């Protein structure tokens, strides 16, 4: 198995813009369509670092801790090292989910 039931990150997690999410939008640096997370403070897009490691650049150079997955809403903590899931995750991880499904 299960993710972290908490993480000292979840108080980095910013408000869900009011424009939703797209899972369909692709990475800011390389456009590709695959694997891309949002980030969970700034909500920008970036790919998996199974394609070319965009949104693990983003982590480095902003420091934003969590990126919720467009594959599966999971959640995962740069810092931490972990899938977590908290009540906190609900509400993004629902909205990408109907945006989803
Ligand atoms: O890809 C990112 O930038 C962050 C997430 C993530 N971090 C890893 C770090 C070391 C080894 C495998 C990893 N695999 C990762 O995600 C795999 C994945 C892909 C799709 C859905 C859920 N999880
Ligand atoms: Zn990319
Ligand atoms: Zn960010
Ligand atoms: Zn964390």
């Known amino acids: 198995g299960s993710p972290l039931p908490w993480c000292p990150h979840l108080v980095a997690v910013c408000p869900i813009p009011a424009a939703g999410l ?3 939008q692709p ?3 390389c456009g ?3 694997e891309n997370w949002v980030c969970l403070s ?3 897009v970036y790919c998996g ?3 070319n490691g965009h949104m693990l650049q983003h982590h480095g150079n902003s420091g ?13 903590c740069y810092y931490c090292q972990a899938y977590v899931h908290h009540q906190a995750l609900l ?6 989910h109907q945006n989803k499904f």
């Open 22 to 24: 797209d899972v369909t």
């Open 27 to 29: 990475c800011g640096d």
């Open 32 to 34: 590709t369509i695959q």
């Open 42 to 44: 700034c909500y920008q």
């Open 49 to 51: 670092r199974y394609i």
């Open 64 to 76: 934003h801790p969590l990126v919720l997955s467009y594959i599966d809403l999971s959640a995962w």
């Open 91 to 96: 509400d993004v991880k629902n909205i990408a």
